[PDB]
Amino acid sequence: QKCKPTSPGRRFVEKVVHDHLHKGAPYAPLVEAKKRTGGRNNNGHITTRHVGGGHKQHYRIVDFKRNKDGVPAVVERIEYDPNRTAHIALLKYADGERRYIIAPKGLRAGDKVQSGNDAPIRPGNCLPLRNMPIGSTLHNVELKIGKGAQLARSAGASVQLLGRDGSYAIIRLRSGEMRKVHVECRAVIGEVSNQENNLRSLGKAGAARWRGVRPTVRGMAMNPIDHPHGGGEGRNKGIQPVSPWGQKAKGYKTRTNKRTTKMIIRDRRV
RNA sequence: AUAGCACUCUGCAAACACGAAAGUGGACGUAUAGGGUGUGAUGCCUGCCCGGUGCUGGAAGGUUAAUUGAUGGGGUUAGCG
Ligand SMILES: [Mg+2]
Ligand SMILES: [Mg+2]
Ligand SMILES: [Mg+2]
Ligand SMILES: [Mg+2]
Numbered sequence: 001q002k003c004k005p006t007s008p009g010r011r012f013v014e015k016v017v018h019d020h021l022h023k024g025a026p027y028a029p030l031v032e033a034k035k036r037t038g039g040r041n042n043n044g045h046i047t048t049r050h051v052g053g054g055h056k057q058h059y060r061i062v063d064f065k066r067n068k069d070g071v072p073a074v075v076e077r078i079e080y081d082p083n084r085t086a087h088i089a090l091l092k093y094a095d096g097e098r099r100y101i102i103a104p105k106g107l108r109a110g111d112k113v114q115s116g117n118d119a120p121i122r123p124g125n126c127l128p129l130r131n132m133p134i135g136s137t138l139h140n141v142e143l144k145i146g147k148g149a150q151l152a153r154s155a156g157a158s159v160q161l162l163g164r165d166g167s168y169a170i171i172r173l174r175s176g177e178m179r180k181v182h183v184e185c186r187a188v189i190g191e192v193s194n195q196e197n198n199l200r201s202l203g204k205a206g207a208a209r210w211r212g213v214r215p216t217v218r219g220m221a222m223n224p225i226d227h228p229h230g231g232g233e234g235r236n237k238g239i240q241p242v243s244p245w246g247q248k249a250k251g252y253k254t255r256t257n258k259r260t261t262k263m264i265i266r267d268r269r270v
Numbered sequence: 271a272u273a274g275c276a277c278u279c280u281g282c283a284a285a286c287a288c289g290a291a292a293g294u295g296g297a298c299g300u301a302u303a304g305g306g307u308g309u310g311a312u313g314c315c316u317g318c319c320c321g322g323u324g325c326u327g328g329a330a331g332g333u334u335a336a337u338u339g340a341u342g343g344g345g346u347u348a349g350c351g
């Protein structure tokens with residue numbers, strides 16, 4: 001979906017149509033307020049730069065735990081969620097309860113989904129990892145028992161269940177890393193719906209300003225008091241590239257955790 | 271400064287930043303996501319060099335601190351004079 005260059009701004013704009021969406025107001029009981037922090041903590045200092053000035057957004061409560069076991073539900077509609085890059089689906093259970101989930105690929109209104117041990121192997125069903133079939137592709141993987149999905153939630157993300165022993169299951173993450181997961185944890189069958197997210201193009205600075213991103217200033221343009229890459233009578237790049245606080249930026253590993261080293265089987269060749 | 275491009279780090283109690291700690295932002299986000307660095311629409315593209323510094327992976331052949339103290343010598347009483 002390219003835009004005709006009627007203006008210098010409209011020349012390099014690419015968007016996704018996805019006309020199958022709801023195109024309406026979201027479910028009111030499942031919507032709560034949400035405000036912009038501006039990248040500042042309770043002390044008032046800027047802890048994360050390049051954040052501020054976006055569009056007003058409400059928060060849609062997505063049910064990540066899916067603890068309603070053995071109750072079949074039907075898909076009502078697919079909606080647009082500004083809080084994430086994926087699409088959401090509205091489910092209606094037998095008793096009449098309404099909940100929001102992460103819509104897998106191809107899920108449309110009228111589909112039947114269950115979250116239990118005896119659930120069949122269909123896209124959108126949540127099952128423990130031991131009941132999962134070997135070699136399949138999963139999403140919304142759970143790490144701690146009972147907390148809810150924490151992995152493969154972005155648009156188009158998916159993991160593969162390589163193998164499972166008696167006590168653990170081996171999965172390969174999207175980054176290329178193989179790690180161990182408890183066999184009691186749960187996952188969902190299929191891949192996340194929104195797949196054409198990376199194919200979009202903003203086209204102008206206005207879109208980045210709409211999405212709540214502030215301009216980035218290179219360290220070279222700053223003064224010696226501001227950035228280590230400061231000073232010089234012209235365009236100069238004096239020292240090894242570092243962060244504004246003195247940390248190396250090229251090929252320097254920053255992982256320091258020692259508590260969960262046993263889980264990672266093979267690294268992503270970092 | 272900018273949309274675009276590339277490199278690199280981060281598997282989530284994430285990397286990173288604030289504080290003396292608790293705690294907070296990142297994010298009520300989950301690698302099509304977040305941070306750092308360089309270049310700057312688009313067309314055609316982007317040659318050689320790992321000697322130096324840096325980073326990454328190893329051997330552990332040489333040395334190496336903290337920790338221990340078999341000895342060796344000295345001082346002073348006591349035994350043989
Ligand atoms: Mg930034
Ligand atoms: Mg940029
Ligand atoms: Mg300085
Ligand atoms: Mg300089």
Ligand SMILES: [Mg+2]
Pocket residue numbers: none
């Ligand atoms: Mg150019």
Ligand code: NA
Pocket residue numbers: 320
């Ligand atoms: Na070198």
